[PDB]
């Protein structure tokens, strides 16, 4: 609607230009201020107020009263400012969500880069499970880095940028990164289930397949969404979900990954309790570390859709995926790279050769 307002303003300017200033009586000023055309000397001049604003649309039949004197000069009670004019007939939660989720993503970026460096700088820790982990941390970093370039771009565009194709590609990159993260959280769960579910597989082939399904498949549904959005709606930097169907294209695959990931979680925890059967506090500690890795907190508000969610429910909803996911990187990092006993023991043995 904002773009339409700009076009409407230009149309009003063109109409004003088409009207010449000559009149039998001296005319008044004619500029764009709400465009004001030539008035009537010595009479009340009225003009149609704009309707491009939400507060102004409620009064479409409103008229701006003006006093154009016979001398072609507007009524000015004082010259200390612009000419006098009479016009009488013509939120914080987002800022809160912004400050709370930007600080968490920064902490994750700091903890993720150091976590990946520790796992990569240790040659004696290279193993398939760690390879999937290192790619998982890299995915989280790319996610954190992408959202940072995103929000700053939005501020730049709103503070040219819209027509430029750069903004569109940036949002696609974010949709691809967030999609890759969810799908890489999936390949982590399916790999854990493959370990538990007794099955003899070749490590090389099953490994490159996990990397393919984690990196390649994100392109199988994010690029179609990009070309579909471009052709249909491209003005808003692919930021306006005009038709739910298009938003469903990039959302259904994610919802599927989360759904098929929760199934693995209930399956994995089922084997844990079965093994522990031969106490509740130990099972509690186990799910608290299994939840961040698989990102099952999304299941708390999963079936609920944006079209259905209204009122404060949106705030309560958007408070989960903006705090847990923002801090999800911290959890997966400290749990599997700092709290893990193996990595610690490696630090204990290297403290002697490093001192």
């Amino acid at each position: 609607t904002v773009q339409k307002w700009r076009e409407y303003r230009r149309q009003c300017q063109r109409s004003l230009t088409e009207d010449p200033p000559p009149a039998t009586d001296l005319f008044c000023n004619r500029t764009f201020d709400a465009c004001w055309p030539d008035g009537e000397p010595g009479s009340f001049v009225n003009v149609s107020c704009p309707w491009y604003l939400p507060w102004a649309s409620s009064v479409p039949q409103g008229h701006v009263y003006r006093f154009c004197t016979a001398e072609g000069l507007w009524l000015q009670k004082d010259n200390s400012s612009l000419p006098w004019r009479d016009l009488s007939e013509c939120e914080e939660q987002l800022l809160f969500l912004y400050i709370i989720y930007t600080v968490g993503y920064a902490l994750s970026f700091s903890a993720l880069v150091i976590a990946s460096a520790i796992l990569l700088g240790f040659r004696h820790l290279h193993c398939t499970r760690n390879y999937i982990h290192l790619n998982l941390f890299a995915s989280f970093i790319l996610r954190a880095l992408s959202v940072f370039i995103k929000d700053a771009a939005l501020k730049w565009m709103y503070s040219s940028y819209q027509d430029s194709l750069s903004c569109r590609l940036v949002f696609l990159l974010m949709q691809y990164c967030v999609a890759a993260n969810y799908y890489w959280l999936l390949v982590e769960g399916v790999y854990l289930y493959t370990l538990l579910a007794f099955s003899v597989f070749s490590e090389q082939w099953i490994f490159r397949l996990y990397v393919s399904i984690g990196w390649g498949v994100p392109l199988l549904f994010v690029v179609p969404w990009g070309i579909v959005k471009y052709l249909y709606e491209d003005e808003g930097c692919w930021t306006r979900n005009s038709n739910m169907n298009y938003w469903l294209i990039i959302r259904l695959p994610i919802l599927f990954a989360i759904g098929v990931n929760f199934l693995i979680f209930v399956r994995v925890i089922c084997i844990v309790v079965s093994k522990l059967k031969a106490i509740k506090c130990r099972l509690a500690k186990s799910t608290l570390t299994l939840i961040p890795l698989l990102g099952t907190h999304e299941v708390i508000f999963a079936f609920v859709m944006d079209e259905h969610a209204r009122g404060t429910l949106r705030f309560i909803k958007l408070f989960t995926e903006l705090s847990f996911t923002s801090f999800q990187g911290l959890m997966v990092a400290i749990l599997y790279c700092f709290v893990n006993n193996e990595v610690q023991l490696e630090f204990r043995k290297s403290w002697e050769r490093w001192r």
Binding site: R9, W247, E321
Partner: peptide, 26 residues
């Protein structure tokens, strides 16, 4: 996910603010 929904809600809020303030300045 909800990241895009927050971006859309934020974008719409900024858009309404830009529209109102811009015409008022003009």
């Amino acid at each position: 996910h909800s990241q895009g929904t927050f971006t859309s809600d934020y974008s719409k809020y900024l858009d309404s603010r830009r529209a109102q303030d811009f015409v008022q300045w003009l």
